[PDB]
DNA sequence: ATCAGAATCCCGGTGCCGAGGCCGCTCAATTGGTCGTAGACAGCTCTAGCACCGCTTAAACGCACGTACGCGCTGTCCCCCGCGTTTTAACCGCCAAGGGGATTACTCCCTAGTCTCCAGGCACGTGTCAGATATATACATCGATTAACGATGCT
DNA sequence: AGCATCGTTAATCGATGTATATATCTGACACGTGCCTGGAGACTAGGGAGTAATCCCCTTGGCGGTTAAAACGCGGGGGACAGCGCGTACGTGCGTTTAAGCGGTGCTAGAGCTGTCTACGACCAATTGAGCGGCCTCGGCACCGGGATTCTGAT
């Protein structure tokens, strides 16, 4: 058995190496769909739209994972915890 | 129902491309709660540039004009 | 289509695919990749009931099934009108047509019935009904 | 309709065809035959089980996702002509091509052939050589709804290919007089449909399908004594508040 | 419907600088949207130039400000040497 | 749990410079007419978007288990705060020189506009190779246990 | 003083993932082609921008007197930081489901283009009243002086 935290260092190594996209299509397409729901009834969304709102949306968990994680080491934790994600959250005046 | 679509493995690989090491049990909620939010923000920008059109479909410039409407300009899909 | 990477690098000679309504289109990816399956000289199809109704794939067909047609994609798209004055249309289209669809087809498909070949078929065997609904339901 | 979502007596007095289908099983499991017949996928298959497992007729299933191994198993399993069941669950398009049976009798329809070649290939899995018992066939539609439009375009279709396949069955050996044969008498057909283009309730009409003699007209007297004479109807809240959910 | 592009143009330019490179069109469509962004962004600063100032045309002179605004540092001063190197020699002949 | 006492709120009084109203004096807002044209509306085509199922398999999920780390607690020490004293540079008030912003009058030449002509660039094909994938083989690295070397103790 | 034993750092070996070499196979990329619409050439008018000249007001500079504020020091108490220990929560691997991915069918709604045809906005002439710069009051608020009240800290 490897030791707890180097599978995660060949994870960071692996998925920084890759362009792969992080999360599946049609969980991500039903979401978009229904948080479009409450705005228009009855829309048609093209294909690369949903790959667009896959990019960016990624793209901006990964910048907000960037910046919790620079809390959290700020906090001398390896740990990120939902007080350094709010705390981003609070610098960069998103809320 | 759908947000739980997004799958702790999923969140979990995300926090791995950013360089996170070690995370901890209560991430995936707010982080959830954090893609349904800018997703909104995203959504009802798009499908207002698609009303303002005429329009039933929500095409790739309409999500284009809405991230470059918030400040954050998306390349490769058109602009 | 997944073993089409191992399955197709040998040589083959008489292949047997059943039910030709799967088959369908040739634009689909198994037609294509049927391609990328090298060569068997010999071929064959078997099928319970031909195309669908509107048969604009005639040509993937007998493209598929025959050298014949596979130079000419286009053509036939016009020559289809028989199917799509009762008696002058069904005449020209219809007796026209078809009768020049008998004329090149006769010796390709082979078709029989139960009866021909028995006669212990009880009855024709098919029946319908009719149902009611519930006002509850019927306001939906 | 209902929170508990129990096996309910309301359940098949919904609609009209679990009382037509609550009419038939007695005389169904009466007669001694069995039944096919053919679904949509997904919850239809599921709630037909729930009726069938609430009057309690045991039935084999079949569908798209299940294995192999079952898939020859469950054939294997038709094959005992000791079969306490009679009816069982077969999907259109999977199962459609899923078996091969010369024991069968009966075949019942709900889809209505969003194509016709999917109706009329699994439509032959009853009639087979050496069958040796009589087959019917059932197709259930409600008046007043869009399905039996779907049955109007059916058979529009079926003269469609009438001048393609009904035009290609004459052709075997090339013969000559055979197709102005079935030109002037299926003619006559596609015209008695064109007519065709522009009750059951009672005890007997429905005896007349499955009775194919006088003597299964004569045992099936045995069950009117229950159904008919018996020693509720069919039928507001849910309308208003069905209403009310189903405008989102 | 014909809708014209950059690509030939960043083609010309990739076979000027790196003669045995080639691009996918992906990358392609990424340099599109970077020569129509840095095309709106110039454009904008000359409008909003030209309308503080109070003048109706747009000249050299807007767009070279608004290239020193744009671009920080040695970007806006390559720049500026390069365009004002072009607009010289098509004057110039 | 409480008085001494230092800071703050409250209230009455006073002086002033900016808020608020008035009055000529425009010059841009309103009206009346034209004149060309952008888009409103109807119609036609046909493409991609919608639903659904069949079928396989890589990924997710549930769980057992270990140990890495978050967090609470304690001790230390150091460094930044609260206050006094002393110095200095901000501030305000006035005065003076002047040059650069602001305007106006005159002029010219650069660009909008239109007409004419043609080829630079574009959709559509054609061939064709860069690299993505698969198999085989070897190297980098982590995780484990060893097994050597040095130091200390005992005889 | 020498030898032996114990402690602990000094040592190698395996299994996994990672890099390299060859073969192969394809789908996206590079190039040629017919065509057509937008770019270049040529010509003309006119109005905006350049340019000279003048006016003035706001910037810069200086000087002197006041004084609030900053620098400098000096105790000391509380908080930053290191260490230590506990417990529990998250990584890690394995067996089991499960929907994702890919394909394939059937339908059709709305994107996309065109062709008229007309209400609607640009544009110019005529006219005038709403808003603005200059100019007057006068009072709400800054400032102050005194008293009552409240919050902090050592008994």
Redo the contacts with the bound molecule.
Sequence with gaps: ????????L??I??YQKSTELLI????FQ?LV?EIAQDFKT???????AVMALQEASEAYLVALFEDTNLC?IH?????I?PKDIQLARRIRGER | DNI??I????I??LARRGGV??????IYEETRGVLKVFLENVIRDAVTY?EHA????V?AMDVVYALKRQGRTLYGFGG | ??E??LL??VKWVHMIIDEG?????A?????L?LN?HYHADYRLILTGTPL?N?LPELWALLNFVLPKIFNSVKSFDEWFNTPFDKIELSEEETLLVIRRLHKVLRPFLLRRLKKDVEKELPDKVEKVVKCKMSALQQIM | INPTRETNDDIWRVAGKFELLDRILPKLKATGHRVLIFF?????MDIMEDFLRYINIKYLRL??????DERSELLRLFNAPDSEYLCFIL?????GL?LNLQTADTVIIFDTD??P??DLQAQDRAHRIGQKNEVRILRLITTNSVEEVILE?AYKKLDIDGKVIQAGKFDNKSTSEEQEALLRSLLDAEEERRKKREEELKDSEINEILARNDEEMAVLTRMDEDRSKKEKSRLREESESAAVYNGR | ?????????V?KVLKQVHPDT???????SIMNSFVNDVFERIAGEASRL?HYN????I?S?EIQTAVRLLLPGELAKHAVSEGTKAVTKYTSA
Aim: proline share 3%; aromatic share 6%; hydrophobic share 20%.
């Design positions: 058995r490897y030791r707890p935290g180097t599978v995660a060949r994870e190594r692996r599946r299509k049609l969980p039903r769909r009855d829309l048609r969304f093209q294909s690369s959290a906090a001398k934790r390896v740990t915890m | 739980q679509g799958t702790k493995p999923a979990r690989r090491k070690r995370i901890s049990g209560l698609t005429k329009r039933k479909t095409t | 289509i997944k089409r990477a197709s690098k309504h799967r088959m369908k289109n634009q689909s990816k198994l037609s990749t990328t669908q509107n | 949509q996928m997904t919850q239809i569908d798209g996702h299940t294995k192999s999907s259109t398009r999977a199962g899923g969003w194509n070649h999917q375009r | 419907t014909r809708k014209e592009s950059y690509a030939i143009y083609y080639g691009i996918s069109s992906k990358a392609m030209a109070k003048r109706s045309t000249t002179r």
